[PDB]
From a paper:
The pyridoxal 5′‐phosphate (PLP) homeostasis protein (PLPHP) is a ubiquitous member of the COG0325 family with apparently no catalytic activity. Although the actual cellular role of this protein is unknown, it has been observed that mutations of the PLPHP encoding gene affect the activity of PLP‐dependent enzymes, B6 vitamers and amino acid levels. Here we report a detailed characterization of the Escherichia coli ortholog of PLPHP (YggS) with respect to its PLP binding and transfer properties, stability, and structure. YggS binds PLP very tightly and is able to slowly transfer it to a model PLP‐dependent enzyme, serine hydroxymethyltransferase.
We serendipitously discovered that the K36A variant of YggS, affecting the lysine residue that binds PLP at the active site, is able to bind PLP covalently. This observation led us to recognize that a number of lysine residues, located at the entrance of the active site, can replace Lys36 in its PLP binding role.
Author numbering: 3 to 228
Amino acid sequence: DIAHNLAQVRDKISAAATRCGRSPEEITLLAVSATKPASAIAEAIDAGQRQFGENYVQEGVDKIRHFQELGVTGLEWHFIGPLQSNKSRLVAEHFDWCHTIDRLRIATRLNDQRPAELPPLNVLIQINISDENSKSGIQLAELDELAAAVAELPRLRLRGLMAIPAPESEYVRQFEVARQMAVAFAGLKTRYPHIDTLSLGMSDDMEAAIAAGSTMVRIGTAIFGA
Ligand SMILES: Cc1ncc(COP(=O)(O)O)c(C=O)c1O
């Protein structure tokens, strides 16, 4: 039951925020609807969910067109998958957020392809904080340079950081890795304008990420099933 699962997930978010002295409103729930049908999204919308994350461009754009066509207003779509240059125009024309900026050329393409009448595309720079197997994300040492370049792109808005840590079962390591991101986020936030988003945490490490300072958790399985 999607409605029931949304309520249950929001309950555990709220508790984890309150337990570590944070307001529940500090945490945005991003419902990851990738691989799920539009009808499952429509259920979530009827249950009050408004922010959806998609991993594949054409799948996401098709859904966005579907709900725009029903005149369903007020949604926020986040592209959270790796972005190839040949699909950037579709992202730039349809999505509200992109979490996976890890090279300047893809950001400049998105900026150039973003219609001027739209709001600037909110972007996060993706950090490979702990996954030796992943091709995605930059090293932290590259952050200052990339953030500076991205920040001048007028049709993008740099909002913060994202990371997909390597899978980790120990709470202690989940926390310390998320803290590495939170420290980097805080340092960016002191010099850059409108840094307010740390996209960090999924179903299995949600509590450590929230304790560490995440502002946005990306939940799929716990809402829609795997
Ligand atoms: C970036 C990102 N966030 C979240 C998820 C899903 O998280 P979970 O199903 O563990 O809640 C995935 C896709 O599986 C993902 O690629």
